[PDB]
Design a protein around this ligand. Structure first.
Ligand SMILES: Cc1nnc2n1-c1ccc(-c3ccc(N)nc3)cc1N(c1ccc(Cl)cc1)C[C@H]2C
Length: 124
């Protein structure tokens, strides 16, 4: 089956607004969300719907842009590096589950390239 999604809000966690977290939501996430190849990555992988029974046998740290949006907008992250780590986890999952040169791998690679260009611009 599917696991519950990752945790996305917790009112016991301390909250802060930073320039870098603001950029990651308002600029980074937005540009990725509207990319041609964003659609597979906008919500948790639904392994039941897609008939991928081994997806969560292989991928033990799930992540998707939907979850990352929820974490940014709920002030779940304290450090910008947490969010960057989550985007990395998302791309890496796709590379782990799939194989070099698969269509979805090319799409993730191109998304990652745009994420890297956008992070280059992260404000201080
Ligand atoms: C992300 C990711 N990492 N691996 C996968 N995915 C993936 C997630 C969601 C979908 C998907 C597929 C159909 C649909 N209606 N909504 C979402 C397809 C995927 N996959 C996918 C998406 C696009 C293309 Cl062209 C091929 C495979 C394959 C699947 C194993």
């Amino acid at each position: 089956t599917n696991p519950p999604p990752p945790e996305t809000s917790n009112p016991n966690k301390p909250k802060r607004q930073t320039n870098q977290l603001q950029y990651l939501l308002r600029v980074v996430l937005k540009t990725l969300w509207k990319h041609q190849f964003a659609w597979p990555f906008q919500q948790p992988v639904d392994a039941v719907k897609l008939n991928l029974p081994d997806y969560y046998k292989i991928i033990k740290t799930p992540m998707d842009m939907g979850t990352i949006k929820k974490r940014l907008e709920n002030n779940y992250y304290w450090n910008a590096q947490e969010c960057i780590q989550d985007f990395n986890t998302m791309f890496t999952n796709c590379y782990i589950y799939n194989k070099p040169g698969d269509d979805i791998v090319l799409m993730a690679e191109a998304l990652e390239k745009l994420f890297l260009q956008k992070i280059n611009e992260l404000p201080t």
